[PDB]
Structure 1
Amino acid sequence: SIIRFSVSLQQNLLDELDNRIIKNGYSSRSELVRDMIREKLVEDNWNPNDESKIAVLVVIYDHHQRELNQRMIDIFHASGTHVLCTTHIHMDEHNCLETIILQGNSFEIQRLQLEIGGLRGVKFAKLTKAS
């Protein structure tokens, strides 16, 4: 049984999507989304309230932001997740790439990527589950 729902997005993202569909010969927009959903479904991945799960969060952000760093800290503290180690490299005047080694439970860790990614100043956020 097939269902449909509509997706909202900006012109910029739609342009990039349509360009790729033409370029790679995707049959439709739905097809690309289906394939990615399937991909996420079958993708390598890691259970209880095991509080010993390890993960790595990768974050690219504008390090000029006066309060961004404190906000990330507060989000980790609120989540009850432990930061074992962090590394910041400045890639250019604007951008810092940070790797964050995390430890906590599965539920909490899986919600960090979106929280951090939504902070203003943050340009990229991607979590990796160590398993």
Structure 2
Amino acid sequence: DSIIRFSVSLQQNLLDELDNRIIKNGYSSRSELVRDMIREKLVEDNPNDESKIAVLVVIYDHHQRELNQRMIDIQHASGTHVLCTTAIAMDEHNSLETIILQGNSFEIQRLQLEIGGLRGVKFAKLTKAS
């Protein structure tokens, strides 16, 4: 009784790229590709109280009103210590921000997920320097 189904929810842009990759790489279903991705990513981590330096890279829609304020509210309410943020415009729609910060594993993970979840944020990717 070893095969189960579990649901996955994808934003449409990601789902469209997944479908294109299934076609380009000769997979026969979304289920097959995702399954293989999971198998692969495993081969390729405990959170702790130790202070670490980290960088969060965020790409966001700079026309989204109040988005910067929300990010600031999250940064200030997080237990992390943000050293600095730097932001540049990529194009007429998007900006890229790098946030350099220090905190423990729990605090930094939470910040990444809170920012990543905001409407208008295209992604929030973390680099940890432990």
Deviation at 1:104? 0.6
Distance 1:11 1:127, change over 3 A: closer
Distance 1:43 1:111, change over 3 A: farther
Deviation at 1:18? 2.6
Deviation at 1:42? 3.4
Q: Could you list the runs of 5+ residues in structure 2 that have no partner in the other structure?
A: none
SS at 1:50 equivalent = coil
Whether the 8 Å contact between 2:55 and 2:126 is mirrored in structure 1 is yes
Deviation at 1:92? 2.2
Whether the 8 Å contact between 1:56 and 1:100 is mirrored in structure 2 is yes
1 CA distance for matches of 2:84 and 2:101? Answer: 8
Query: TM-score by structure 2 length?
Result: 0.78
2 CA distance for matches of 1:88 and 1:9? Answer: 27
Q: Could you list the runs of 5+ residues in structure 1 that have no partner in the other structure?
A: none
Distance 1:2 1:20, change over 3 A: same
Sequence identity (%):
97
2 CA distance for matches of 1:65 and 1:11? Answer: 19
Deviation at 1:41? 2.8
Distance 1:39 1:100, change over 3 A: farther
Show CA shifts across 1:79-117 (max 9, x none): 201111221112223221101112111112123223112
Deviation at 1:30? 2.3
Count of residue correspondences: 129
SS at 2:106 equivalent = helix
Deviation at 1:12? 5.7
Whether the 8 Å contact between 1:51 and 1:103 is mirrored in structure 2 is no
Deviation at 1:122? 1.5
Show CA shifts across 1:55-83 (max 9, x none): 11111112234422221122122220111
Deviation at 1:4? 1.9
Q: Cα RMSD over matched residues?
A: 2.6
